[PDB]
Design a protein around this ligand. Structure first.
Ligand SMILES: Cc1cnc(Cl)nc1-c1ccc(N(Cc2ccc(CNC(=O)C(F)F)cc2)C(=O)c2ccc(O)cc2O)cc1
Ligand SMILES: Cc1cnc(Cl)nc1-c1ccc(N(Cc2ccc(CNC(=O)C(F)F)cc2)C(=O)c2ccc(O)cc2O)cc1
Ligand SMILES: Cc1cnc(Cl)nc1-c1ccc(N(Cc2ccc(CNC(=O)C(F)F)cc2)C(=O)c2ccc(O)cc2O)cc1
Ligand SMILES: Cc1cnc(Cl)nc1-c1ccc(N(Cc2ccc(CNC(=O)C(F)F)cc2)C(=O)c2ccc(O)cc2O)cc1
Ligand SMILES: [K+]
Ligand SMILES: [K+]
Lengths: 373, 373
């Protein structure tokens, strides 16, 4: 039945695309039939691969109402896509119906990330963090959210190209404009909560072509989400660390375009965090708190906004970038986004379900070749 | 014979000590008999554990004359220490002879690190980098050099305490003075090679106790070696990146003492390195070059000095610190030393030979749970 369908498509590996391919495959003669032939296999493959790992979750997380809802959305979308596997690519009605289905799935899966996050809240509310399976939850969520980002990318591209900027990709994404947009939105929320906010000091270096505007091929909303998250963190740190003084140091952002890397470095004077404690910030169980209640006029704390640091790092890593933190405890913190400057180096990073993935859920990863202390 | 002796002591695990224990065990009533009872077991254990891994090296590396020499030094030292296993701790002559043996071994093992490094040079000269075993060489060298650092620490402590500052530990190591010493020695060599050098801009924050000198319990030479390495790197980068202009930006160092971390951050404007290429800098095969020839009056390139980046990071990690690089390609690089501010958190990080270690030499570590591209 459904287990048989999931098993069939989970045998296959997802096929990673580059940003250059996304761009090229949807510009001149963007071909809906070609997208159909690809996506009627690729979407079931990507859904089925991650659905196998949902099934490996600790029972107390798997059974939460929010996870059950996400799983039922994936099951229903898988079945609806599989209705097309035996249609002909020259059947115009089948092509039109497939695009309608993609658009429908795109809307249905619109709040997958907040709903999975609420399952994690339900889980640690009703049972706590079982330490034995907590490595499994961390491993799963990195892969589920990356999978979701990759599925959203395909749904967006097909819906935007054929539901009637290349799709959601801007071939000339203006990096500094996105950064200023992130700063202004974060500052607005900072002002509401702290009644003040740090100024922005922005510096840029186009090493590739000095003095020229810094542009890359990118999905602007991905960059926005990452820079918003980092501004929010640096503002919370600055405003709370210097609350007694009432004088708030600026947040400095340094943007550099090198031969290979676009780098966005954000520096604050928020007092920092010791190295021992920094990796908790990328842990889902540690970083998920119940969302603020609706029924209040009081300003929402900054922690109540954004995708969070782990998902932000996944956005960077999705196209072979990264997001790294390094702090000087007592002084402040540097946060750095790395993005590939070239669209041909920007290849999807996708999880795959196989024996190695399954073994991860059933092994303990203890570095016994070094002394414990 | 010797295999039987190595096998016997390699069954045991090394016993990590904290800096606070090193300090306390050698101050009031520093007891030579107590050190003897500990070290006549601990030194054979640490030697035997790493000797088992020497034996796992690729034959073409193991058979180099330099590795054979290091191995013969370890074999001879192991046997000489084992002569004491059945002596009585109340035999004053045995105690005196043991201290003499420790002092002798300390001198004999004095150039273990340069000799092992020359074996690596011989290896990649005569056969190249066999890609199948190159993961093994990297794994081994991290562990061999850390082991050597730990054995040197024990030999130094016993020799300095009983061969007649607590041993080699300064309970009040003046961090900024060591940093300036590293800068001045690096600058001297930079001037000789480039006929100019960057200035030092030094800033400090004692968050723990503002305005007070920054001091920690530490081994000053370990800190010196790390900061020298980083100065040398930042000077090479600055002088070569700005050679055309003839104006050289300073190297900025920011020292912070937090509740938990002593941090030393070194920033340069040397043009940086892309993220994809930064990890090669910690790879022994990549970072080992033949040493400069003696028979020349020409200034020695900066790369010919120091322990190198991998060993420098091992020095940081030896007492639960770290050494991290983050670069903005096109602009410059930040290098950060992390040191535990408290002697009780500074616990030896020691490799141990067991089934997990052996499996590392006989497995391939391929992240098959993610798509390759
Ligand atoms: C055209 C289109 C529009 N919108 C979307 Cl979301 N996707 C597409 C699309 C993307 C890839 C393909 N693939 C699938 C595909 C999959 C992977 C790759 C490269 N990556 C790998 O091989 C991976 F396995 F490592 C390239 C192409 C093709 O084989 C293909 C590409 C161009 C073309 O003119 C005709 C085609 O049939 C087809 C359609
Ligand atoms: C993870 C997170 C999520 N949402 C929000 Cl609003 N803030 C955080 C968060 C922000 C800053 C930090 N800290 C540590 C920290 C924690 C609390 C404070 C405020 N408290 C005080 O200083 C006062 F208690 F002394 C300051 C700094 C950093 O140094 C830091 C981390 C990431 C980053 O991108 C930028 C950063 O500055 C930790 C968590
Ligand atoms: C006194 C001395 C001088 N110089 C040197 Cl290099 N070492 C020593 C020395 C260090 C430790 C010990 N150990 C060995 C030892 C080993 C490990 C630890 C802590 N670490 C662990 O247990 C490790 F396994 F995790 C503590 C002590 C003791 O058991 C010991 C300590 C103090 C004392 O007054 C009497 C003693 O017999 C003995 C001598
Ligand atoms: C690893 C190493 C060993 N010994 C010596 Cl003398 N230098 C190096 C080395 C130094 C700097 C780098 N680069 C990259 C690099 C390489 C060459 C140059 C010089 N060449 C040019 O800029 C010119 F070609 F354009 C500059 C920067 C850095 O950005 C960097 C790395 C570590 C560090 O602690 C500090 C750093 O600045 C790489 C290797
Ligand atoms: K699969
Ligand atoms: K052992």
């Amino acid at each position: 039945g459904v287990p048989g369908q999931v098993d069939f498509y989970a045998r296959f590996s997802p096929s990673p695309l580059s940003m250059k391919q996304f761009l090229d495959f949807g510009s001149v003669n963007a071909c809906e039939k070609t997208s159909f032939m690809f996506l009627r296999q690729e979407l079931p493959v990507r859904l089925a691969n991650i659905m196998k790992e949902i099934s490996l979750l600790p029972d107390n997380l798997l059974r939460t109402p929010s996870v059950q809802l996400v799983q039922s959305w994936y099951i229903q979308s898988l079945q609806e896509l599989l209705d097309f596997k035996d249609k002909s690519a020259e059947d115009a009605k089948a092509i039109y119906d497939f695009t309608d289905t993609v658009i429908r799935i795109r809307n249905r899966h619109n709040d997958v990330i907040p709903t999975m996050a609420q399952g994690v809240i339900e889980y640690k509310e009703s049972f706590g963090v079982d330490p034995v399976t907590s490595q499994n939850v961390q491993y799963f969520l990195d892969r589920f959210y990356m999978s979701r980002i990759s599925i959203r990318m395909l749904l967006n591209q097909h819906s935007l190209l054929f539901g009637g900027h290349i799709g959601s990709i801007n071939p000339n994404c203006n990096v500094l404009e996105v950064i200023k947009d992130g700063y202004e939105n974060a500052r607005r929320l900072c002002d509401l909560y702290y009644i003040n906010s740090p100024e922005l000091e922005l510096e840029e270096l186009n090493a590739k072509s000095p003095g020229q505007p810094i542009q890359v091929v990118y999905v602007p909303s991905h960059l926005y989400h990452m820079v918003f998250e980092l501004f929010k963190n640096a503002m919370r740190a600055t405003m709370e660390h210097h609350a007694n003084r009432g004088v708030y140091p600026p947040i400095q952002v340094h943007v550099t375009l090198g031969n290979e890397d676009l780098t966005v470095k954000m520096s604050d004077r928020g007092g920092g965090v010791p190295l021992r404690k920094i990796d908790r910030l990328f842990n889902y169980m540690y970083s998920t708190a119940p969302r603020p209640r609706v029924e209040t006029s009081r300003a929402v704390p900054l922690a109540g906004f954004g995708y969070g640091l782990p998902i932000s790092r996944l956005y960077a890593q999705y196209f072979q970038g990264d997001l790294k933190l390094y702090s000087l405890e007592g002084y402040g913190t540097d946060a750095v986004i790395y993005i590939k400057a070239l669209s041909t180096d920007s290849i999807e990073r996708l999880p795959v379900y196989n024996k190695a993935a399954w073994k991860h859920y059933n092994t303990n990863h203890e570095a016994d070749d070094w002394c414990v202390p």
